[model samples]
Target chain A: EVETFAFQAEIAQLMSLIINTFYSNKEIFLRELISNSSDALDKIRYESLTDPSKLDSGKELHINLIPNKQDRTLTIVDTGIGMTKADLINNLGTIAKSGTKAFMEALQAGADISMIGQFGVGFYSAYLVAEKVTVITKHNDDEQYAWESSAGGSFTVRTDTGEPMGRGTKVILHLKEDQTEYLEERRIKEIVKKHSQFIGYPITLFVE
Target chain B: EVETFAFQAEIAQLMSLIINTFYSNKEIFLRELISNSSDALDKIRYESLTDPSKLDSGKELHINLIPNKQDRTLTIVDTGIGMTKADLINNLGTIAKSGTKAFMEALQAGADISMIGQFGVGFYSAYLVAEKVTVITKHNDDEQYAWESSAGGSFTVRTDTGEPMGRGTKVILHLKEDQTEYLEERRIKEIVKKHSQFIGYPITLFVE
Candidate 1:
């Protein structure tokens, strides 16, 4: 059975608030998503300190993005601890993300991010450019699962259709028509440097 | 008719809270006052665009902080649109101001300024370090006036102190015993450059 959970009304309200309140700044979507991946890397690194087996081969904890122009798809793959069916529902479906909560608290404290990056509302930024997003993930302790959403009221979860990648997660984004600028390797690289240059983790973009 | 416009209860509470809240970062006092001056300059320049006579003798917008060591007094002067008795009371005592509202809107829109400045709240920031503040000003439309306040419950207004501070405004701050750093030129100057460098106007510190 594919386990799924519905989002609370507050989650939808907060999501729409973040999306509509920030206008004309579609470039921040990529920056915020990359920052989330960086936080994921940090989480695994912290866990690995105590468990040691949480990381995959201790592969330097880097983020890799593969862009396919023909398919009009952007895939971000991370080698951190993947999620199970329940993990997917809790993480990708529910509004209990620790990182997002910490980000909002930081903003409330007036901690300067200069141009607004790292708010817990970062996940919702994907709606700025992507029409649909699919996340295929395999956790270290559970069976592989897939989560899909269009950033509105509803989302879907199911068992992996194909063989799951070992010990990691892969996110595939179907870019909207107006957001075609992100398909260009040069533009993606430039935007990354502009927003994520000072970020602690390194990011690699693989052009197809 | 005695128009008793006591600072609204919420505003009074907010003002005292601001004084206590920002007490730790007391050095931001000059930065705040200089920013207020820069805002006045912007208002005058914008008005001068349509009304040629609006731009008075203060051709350039600048903030100069002068201190008297023996008198234990610090003065922050700006060559911008000066305030009359009504303007001073309205800006200092009343809440609704068009210039301040415009500044807040600009800040929320993520628009960058030529300088690091905001028109509102900066006026009250003087209370962060001073026991008393005296503002002497001359508006192009009216004669000179003086505004004096200990930042407590009430304020007093009278005629100007000096031979009319040309065509701009001078704010004299009587520093408390612990606020002596503001009496030093180099210290105040360093703070101005660090915080107000992005401000669209020139800011300097003078002590004699």
Candidate 2:
């Protein structure tokens, strides 16, 4: 099952702003994506406080980067709370209105993380370096779904029946021709260490 | 004459979150507000590139912190593009939206500041330390206006009609009973130097 929808009014404008406005600092895309993955993990960890079985109850949480030179695709995977079809549309289609704000409020009263994505637009930042981005996520309560976009003011969501991720998301970015520099493991490592060295989750880089 | 209005729904919720949550790191209130001040100065500097009459055309731009222990208040003043009555309402009434983000976008293509308030709730961080806050400002095209709030979900704005600021904003924080430590000159200097030392604008501590 697949469906397509236009980006919310603010999201369209934000995507245009990120892609057309931020032309020089393209490396921040990786940092923003990783920060969001950490936040998702944080949410799951927080949720586990009450439910205990939000999936991956006692498993160690972390982020993984898989770079493929042959396909020119870089994928970031996290063992966090994945988004369902509705979560994909609601989260990715909006801008500036954060889900984490509500999550932060509900969990443990007051907390502050590096939390770069609280504005709801950090996910679109990936469009800075990727011509096409695909998000495959599996949620504990819903079926897996794949959300894909190219910063073209619209995105598509479809059921992902390929492989069960258990829980969490895999963001695959198809690098633009000029963004091939991101495919190098050394460059990715430098960016991660520079931007997300303090993130609570351990980030693993898988280069093949 | 002063007029009162309720904060936009999101702004009210965000203020409540900042005040009731974030109970421990109240010192961050100073850092967040100062970051906003620097951003406002950055805006006026950028505006001067096209319009020369904004404020302090060739004068030195800086921030001044005046701590009055007798009055139990701390004042932060900046020489930047101050807000009009309408700007005061519109800017301060909203949450999760940032004026600095727009200013940053208009400046040099892609850039990032220490930017403590990218999520647009940084202003409310002041509530972490203060019982009430007042903003007095003057814009190029508008008369001076004063906006006051107490983290009570509603605020008041009025004509200044007092000593003219020439331009920019003055934020007066009425420190809470326990937050009076912020009134010490030494503490203010340490916080400014520690958190905002790298800020482009000069920060001056006014002790008399």
Candidate 3:
């Protein structure tokens, strides 16, 4: 059975503000999500510096986008340090609390390259273009789990029965009524090149 | 006597999040402030289209950035629709309740160009680069007034005793300890040109 939970009052309020106020730049949703994937990849890469075992041995670090026109769905997958069930609850169920804050502070102290994921609110931006979002993830430390939300304040999480992802997360966005534009290959490519061109990892768009 | 007021708790919390989370991109402060000025100019210009008297007659619409190195201050002045005392209290003392929402909705429907001042929180972005900020404004409908704050939960407003601005607003920032870089004319010009090159009105860098 899937466990369900309601978003905290502050979380709901923050999400409302983001959806309404940021409607003008709907493309920002993709940019923020991709940046988040990049951050997740960076985390594992950094951890590998001290404990080589955290490298996942042979998996490459990259982001993949799959757009399904017929189904009006867009999926963004990344090979990175995926979140556990608790992480999905604590990180996504609250507002202004970021798991990457410590990493960000260390990077800000001396790193030259700008890390794009500082604000925890970036994850909720997906709600702008998605009616429902499904996240399947595996973190090595825990079993694979899936989180699903409709942006209506409640969410559900369950054990993933699908094929093992090895490591990382996959986000599938059910496009909104007017968000079919995101399922176009050319549009996704353009937005990726425009926003994440300088991203350290390779980004690929799947075509059907 | 100066009237002191406290920002609503939610507004204060939101401002704190913006300052801490957005520290990675401190330059966003200038971009947001200048964008607000441009919106102010746009508002007055639109009003003047139907009522000619709203234009301030011979006064031109422009933005001026004055940097004072000795005093560690940066002042951004705009010949736009300055706010009345109540406008300042209500708009800056809250979040998400943008005064421009109605105008923005109309513009979004069919307008050709994009306007960047939808979120009311943009004004508080000044706190990113400044330890304290002072805003002196003159509105056609109200007497000149000054609003000052250190972003420490509360702010103060008082009738301005200084020379009248004729029309528009001036924002003065008391630079933070390490934010002296914003006091350079070259830096200010570069930032303005980079972020606001397409702004409708001219931007001038005032050297001391």
Candidate 4:
């Protein structure tokens, strides 16, 4: 079954503020997603200390940054602790809607790269360069699910009927027309080296 | 109508992470509070554009940084649109709790100073330099209220039964034993000149 969540009243206004008004380097989307991924990886490792059974994914910990040029898609996948549907609502639904005016000011005033995920709106920054975002995640205790949003007032989440999966999150960004530059290997590598070298993970890119 | 709010689970853990573990400049409390005040002031001006009655404060439009060495308090007062009781509950109650691990990492990694307020934990940084924080606020449409908190997991809010206040917020920080430098006008002035000089309003420190 699919559930659609309308962002609280002011989310649309904030979407407009971030995507339209705030101007900064668009490459931070990669940095933010990688940061979030690193966090999930950290949590699962810590959660496993008391309960070894939490290692349900049985997958090695790492992040993969894959770009599909023909399709114009960039997917940052991680074998970290993924989210349940409840987490989708809690993590992406509630706190994701923040006070936009102050956040916008912070962005314009050159906020740190780390503040991205702390602000809860870090995931939404993908909207700065993508027309749509699709997130598919699997948790050890919960079934796999897909969450989708289009920089609009609402987001939709539904169980993923695709292939069976372990624990992890895969964020796929459908690039905007002018954002094709992000499809290049050099561009992503540059961003990763500049902003993400300290992320404490092996961030590998798929190459032909 | 006195009330108290217990921060969500894990907020205490985050407090420990910030005050004891994160080693950064403690002067950012002034910057974060001033930035918040500037946002509130900017909002009231914008709100008054469509509805002039929102100007119930009738006070001048600026921020005052007052210090009391004998009293051992540092107050950052703003005649901006303040918060109602409900606003207090919603704004401070929800979203203030975040994923502490990632936020802690970002802070340790030297996050941008502006990201403080965006993270919702910016105000809590008062714990770095002060023992207690007292917030008195009045909204045009509601009665005056006071919110108080230590680094503990809970905070309190109540009606301001003493002096009648116009629209605004006053944040009084009781300086810590070893952090008495914040009570010095010269120290605060130097911080203001370094960080808060760009804020649109006047930030004046009261003299003895």
User: Model 4 over residues B114-192: C-alpha lDDT tens digits?
Assistant: 3555455567777788888898998887898888888667888888886776788898999888888888778888998
lDDT score for residue B188 of model 4: 84
Cα lDDT tens digits, model 3, A1-208, are 8999987666665556545653356887898888778767766665564477886633698899999988889999998888878778765422232223322343445421122233345677787789899999988788989999887688899999998898888999999989898998888888987776545567888889
What do the candidate models score in CA lDDT, each in turn? 0.65, 0.72, 0.72, 0.74
Model 3 residue-pair collision total: 0
Candidate 2, CAPRI quality class derived from DockQ:
incorrect
Give lDDT: candidate 2, residue A58: 37
Fraction of native Cα-Cα interface contacts (under 8 Å, chains A and B) also present in model 4: 0.00
Off by over 4 Å in 4: A1-208, B22-24, B90-94, B99-101, B105-118
Give the alpha carbon lDDT tens digit for every residue of B1-208 in model 3.
Answer: 9899997676666556545653456776898788778767755665564477887533588999889988899999998888878778864422233223322343445421122233344677787788899999988888999999887789899999997788888999999989998998788888887776545567888768
**Where does candidate 1 stray beyond 4 Å?**
A1-208, B1-5, B93-119
Top model by lDDT, which number? 4
Instruction: Quickly count the clashes in candidate 1.
Output: 7
TM-score of 2: 0.51
lDDT of 4 by residue, A159-186 (tens): 9998666889899999999998888988
Better of 2 and 4 by TM-score: 4
Candidate 3 residues lying further than 4 Å off, grouped into runs, are A20-22, A93-118, B1-208
- Write candidate 1's Cα lDDT for A1-208 as tens digits: 6655665555555455555664676777777777667656645655565467676645566788888888788878777666667656654522333334444455466543323343244566676778888888877777778888776766789888686577667788888877788889889888887776544445788857
lDDT of 2 by residue, B141-173 (tens): 788899999867799988998778888889999
Q: After superposition, how far is residue B3 of candidate 2 from its true place, in Å?
A: 42
Candidate 1 chain A worst ten-residue window by lDDT = A111-120
